Amino acid sequence: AGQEILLVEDNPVNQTVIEAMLRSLGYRVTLVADGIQAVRSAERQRYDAILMDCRLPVLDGYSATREIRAQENGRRVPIIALTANALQGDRENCLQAGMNDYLAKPFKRAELQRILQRWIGSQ
Ligand SMILES: [Ca+2]
């Protein structure tokens, strides 16, 4: 049970931690580890929200997000960027792709809770 979150995160410990935080807030989680599978996973299912890590192994968050936004169900799904480098490049790249919001790493469980409730708490 719970709204379905697509988590796009390549680092193993962040996968562990963020998937656990999401499940601790009642969410279902689908984990992908790069931009390309994020694009596929978003075109094959309607998520309630997508958490897009900015820096990924092969296809980064900017390009992945532009691809999802060009899908007819992807035009409108909330996409929240995860950034460790807002002022070291991500505001000049990832964050311009058509995000609803962003979360700065390292982030608290409460901060994750508050950004998701903002975007999908009313629906
Ligand atoms: Ca990363």
Domain residues of the chain, as ranges? 1-123
* CA of 10 relative to ligand 1 center, distance in Å: 5
* CA of 37 relative to ligand 1 center, distance in Å: 14
The whole-angstrom separation of Cα 103 and Cα 60 is: 16
Alpha helices in 1-123 (DSSP H): 12-24, 35-44, 61-69, 109-120
The whole-angstrom separation of Cα 34 and Cα 8 is: 6
Resolution in A for the shown PDB structure?
Answer: 1.3
* CA of 56 relative to ligand 1 center, distance in Å: 5
Q: Is the N-terminal amide bond of 106 cis, ω within 30° of 0?
A: yes
Contact between 36 and 59 (Cβ < 8 Å) = yes
